[PDB]
């Protein structure tokens, strides 16, 4: 029940607004629009050493939100920062998910439990345990196309054939692993094969890019003359 203005604000105000929106959306299971909001918030915020409190809080959230999607933010990210001290927990949280070992993830979230609770990503860390598993079976399907559930149990220490069957079955509804199970032959056969320059797929993709380019077109046109018209009106030599 909107009334937020984009009329006359500071870029301070857009940074606060976009932070609160991303965060709120995260726990209610929408991660996609939250991505837009938090990526947006950092850039709008003034980049300075007295603003380091607000900026530091945004960086922590953003990576955590990337892990929630099942995408992985850069190891490059945690390393070249001068944020390293505070970005000490997140690096391990990303690494645990990336390598898809569940045992590492359990030790991490225990060990940093105090640090995370402050920044209140702790409730989100519990949800990331789903995302662990997702990364760990993603690797297996990509590396071996056709692999028996038996071998997946060996590799990632699943309990049984059944336990992994259910994981995949749930996962491919959401299109994460992108495979199909062969029940009778006892394996998982991966369905990714690319080459969609035969498909009609490029047209939709391209149109979304042309809509971003059209947004940039509208956005320049209105704003350019506007300082000029005021500045011409005011007296000069």
């Amino acid at each position: 029940k909107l009334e937020y203005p984009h009329t006359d604000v500071s870029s301070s105000l857009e940074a606060r607004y976009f932070f609160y929106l991303s965060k709120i959306n995260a726990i209610q299971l929408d991660y996609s629009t939250a991505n837009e909001y938090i990526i947006a918030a950092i850039r709008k915020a003034p980049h300075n050493s007295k603003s380091l409190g607000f900026l530091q809080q945004s960086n922590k959230l953003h990576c955590c939100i990337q892990l929630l999607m099942g995408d992985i933010p850069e190891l490059s990210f945690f390393h070249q920062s001068n944020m390293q001290k505070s970005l000490l927990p997140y690096y391990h949280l990303t690494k645990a998910v990336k390598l898809g070992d569940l045992k590492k993830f359990t030790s991490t979230i225990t060990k940093y439990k105090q640090l995370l609770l402050k920044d209140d990503t702790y409730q989100l860390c519990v949800r990331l345990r789903s995302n662990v598993i997702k990364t760990g079976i993603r690797i297996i399907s990509l590396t071996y196309k056709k692999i028996s559930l038996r071998d997946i149990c060996l590799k990632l220490n699943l309990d049984s054939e059944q336990t992994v069957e259910y994981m995949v079955s749930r996962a491919i509804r959401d299109g994460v692993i992108e495979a199909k199970i062969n029940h009778e032959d006892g394996f998982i056969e991966t369905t990714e094969l690319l080459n969609i320059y035969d498909s009609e797929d490029p047209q939709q993709v391209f149109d979304e890019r042309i809509k971003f380019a059209n947004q940039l077109h509208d956005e320049y046109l209105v704003s350019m003359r506007y300082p000029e018209d005021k500045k011409t009106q005011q007296n000069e030599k």
């Binding site: 995949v168 079955s169 749930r170 491919i172 199909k180 029940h183 047209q203 939709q204 059209n214």
Partner: protein
């Protein structure tokens, strides 16, 4: 739980023998497993389920109702949108 499992297994495979259905979808009688399937719109013919039936029928229904031409977007429609953005 049963309905959640039931949805996920359509994607996985087209067919599971009657016995493999009972274990997955959690029943205690083989006659309940078969009855549930009939009501849910899978025919058991030759002790093989056909998960594909319901999926085709749901899909047929979406094509039956019409909102439909714009949401997918025609070729003609994309190209008409470019020219008019420019020309304002």
């Amino acid at each position: 739980i049963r309905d959640e499992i039931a949805k996920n297994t359509e994607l996985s495979y087209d067919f599971l023998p009657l016995s493999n259905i009972k274990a997955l979808l959690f029943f205690n009688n083989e006659k309940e497993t078969e009855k549930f399937a009939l009501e849910r719109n899978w025919p058991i013919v030759n002790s093989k389920v056909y998960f594909n039936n319901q999926s085709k029928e749901k899909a047929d229904y979406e094509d039956e109702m019409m909102h439909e031409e714009d949401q997918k977007t025609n070729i003609i429609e994309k190209a008409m949108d470019y020219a008019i953005s420019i020309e304002n």
